[PDB]
Design a protein around this ligand. Structure first.
Ligand SMILES: CC(=O)N[C@H]1[C@H](O[C@@H]2[C@@H](O)[C@@H](O)O[C@H](CO)[C@@H]2O)O[C@H](CO)[C@@H](O[C@@H]2O[C@H](CO)[C@H](O)[C@H](O)[C@H]2O)[C@@H]1O[C@@H]1O[C@@H](C)[C@@H](O)[C@@H](O)[C@@H]1O
Ligand SMILES: CC(=O)N[C@H]1[C@H](O[C@@H]2[C@@H](O)[C@@H](O)O[C@H](CO)[C@@H]2O)O[C@H](CO)[C@@H](O[C@@H]2O[C@H](CO)[C@H](O)[C@H](O)[C@H]2O)[C@@H]1O[C@@H]1O[C@@H](C)[C@@H](O)[C@@H](O)[C@@H]1O
Ligand SMILES: CC(=O)N[C@H]1[C@H](O[C@@H]2[C@@H](O)[C@@H](O)O[C@H](CO)[C@@H]2O)O[C@H](CO)[C@@H](O[C@@H]2O[C@H](CO)[C@H](O)[C@H](O)[C@H]2O)[C@@H]1O[C@@H]1O[C@@H](C)[C@@H](O)[C@@H](O)[C@@H]1O
Ligand SMILES: CC(=O)N[C@@H]1[C@@H](O[C@@H]2O[C@@H](C)[C@@H](O)[C@@H](O)[C@@H]2O)[C@H](O[C@@H]2O[C@H](CO)[C@H](O)[C@H](O)[C@H]2O)[C@@H](CO)O[C@H]1O
Ligand SMILES: CC(=O)N[C@@H]1[C@@H](O[C@@H]2O[C@@H](C)[C@@H](O)[C@@H](O)[C@@H]2O)[C@H](O[C@@H]2O[C@H](CO)[C@H](O)[C@H](O)[C@H]2O)[C@@H](CO)O[C@H]1O
Ligand SMILES: CC(=O)N[C@@H]1[C@@H](O[C@@H]2O[C@@H](C)[C@@H](O)[C@@H](O)[C@@H]2O)[C@H](O[C@@H]2O[C@H](CO)[C@H](O)[C@H](O)[C@H]2O)[C@@H](CO)O[C@H]1O
Ligand SMILES: [Mg+2]
Ligand SMILES: [Mg+2]
Ligand SMILES: [Mg+2]
Lengths: 89, 89, 89
């Protein structure tokens, strides 16, 4: 079965759900008006997520793992970038 | 091993933990006074969760997956209902 | 592949990511200045997490599962202790 991770923010709310399937992670999004597939699409067998607000601006961190490597992906308003996280050291 | 997902809200806090075991998801609840088994009991091999407050009212979304199908379950004060989420399209 | 769970709080933010690998869970931490390995290191094949603030104080609950047993681990400012959670009854 596929594996999911979810986060949400505000009172509308906005929700993001990430799904790992066959080595790829896809993103589904709700901002009050319907579900749509988001811009996040990266490799991974496993996913987790967290998010926080700075005022009205959302910041999202998605942790995508394959083997023993976890890659952090970052949303800070400007598309998906890679983060400084590593699993060790 | 079983697979879990957790959410919490407020300062008491309230906590909900969902566990997928043998194709079924069960719910455990803390509201400050002890752990009890919640009303949520639905099929799934995998579970994730998120929640948010609107004032003092909690809203919970549980994403239950079997195969490639993810079903969203909703708490909005009135028992568990199904949501509009789909994994694609 | 390893399995992760993530939580975050405040606006800095602080982030904690828990990774289950080969029956052990380790913790990675960000408080604004770099990633470091945290004090949490306990057995588990599966992990989930939630956290909440009471004023400026973080409280973290990590649910570590092996077989059908889920152990709750608690941070309340004073190291990692075990919680009252059980999966049933
Ligand atoms: C890739 C990275 O490590 N990003 C950092 C960010 O680094 C910047 C440098 O890469 C370079 O561009 O120089 C600038 C300053 O001149 C930065 O130092 O530094 C940020 C501030 O310390 C980190 O924090 C987040 O930054 C976001 C914008 O990128 C946004 O403002 C957010 O609110 C900040 O918390 C950023 O680290 C990334 O985010 C943190 C929370 C962790 O997830 C970390 O692993 C990420 O790499
Ligand atoms: C099943 C569903 O899609 N629920 C929607 C809800 O739909 C209602 C219609 O089904 C019908 O009953 O007509 C009423 C209005 O006359 C609604 O349109 O519409 C809500 C408002 O847009 C959605 O948002 C949540 O609604 C909750 C009560 O059901 C509660 O008020 C909450 O605060 C609202 O955010 C609701 O969508 C569901 O919740 C959102 C957040 C997503 O999880 C979505 O996939 C869910 O279906
Ligand atoms: C192990 C446990 O059940 N901890 C409880 C805590 O129990 C204490 C008793 O073990 C004994 O020491 O006596 C004192 C009072 O004299 C306590 O009753 O009781 C807390 C208050 O009800 C529980 O709540 C958290 O306590 C934290 C400090 O341990 C901290 O203050 C936090 O803000 C409180 O919510 C505590 O339960 C644990 O935390 C809750 C949220 C659940 O996760 C539960 O399963 C945990 O065991
Ligand atoms: C802040 C916010 O909600 N931005 C929305 C856009 O991006 C989505 O949400 C963010 C937070 C991330 O989860 C993204 O991966 C996700 O797609 C969203 O999509 C953006 O649309 C642009 C066209 O309007 C463009 O295609 C861009 O590449 C894409 O990411 C749009 C609605 O589709 O709404 C924003 O509110
Ligand atoms: C808001 C809240 O905490 N409601 C509690 C009731 O429901 C629990 O919590 C909600 C948020 C969901 O997680 C539920 O699945 C969960 O059970 C809770 O249980 C309800 O009890 C009723 C009898 O009082 C009735 O049996 C109902 O079917 C059941 O869902 C009760 C305590 O058991 O406390 C409420 O605070
Ligand atoms: C509140 C806070 O951020 N405390 C930090 C210390 O502990 C870390 O964060 C807490 C919330 C848990 O996630 C811990 O498992 C995690 O390690 C942190 O580490 C502590 O350092 C002490 C020396 O300063 C000591 O070694 C202790 O055993 C250890 O847990 C320190 C920075 O390393 O920062 C605190 O802010
Ligand atoms: Mg979540
Ligand atoms: Mg959680
Ligand atoms: Mg999380």
């Amino acid at each position: 079965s596929v594996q999911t991770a979810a986060t949400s923010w505000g009172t509308v709310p906005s929700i993001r759900v990430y799904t790992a399937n066959n080595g790829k992670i896809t993103e589904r999004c709700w901002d009050g008006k319907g579900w749509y597939t988001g811009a996040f699409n990266e490799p991974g067998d496993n996913v987790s997520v967290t998010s926080w607000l700075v005022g009205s601006a959302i910041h999202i961190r998605v942790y995508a793992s394959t083997g023993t490597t976890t890659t952090e992906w970052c949303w800070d308003g400007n598309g998906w970038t890679k983060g400084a996280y590593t699993a060790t050291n």
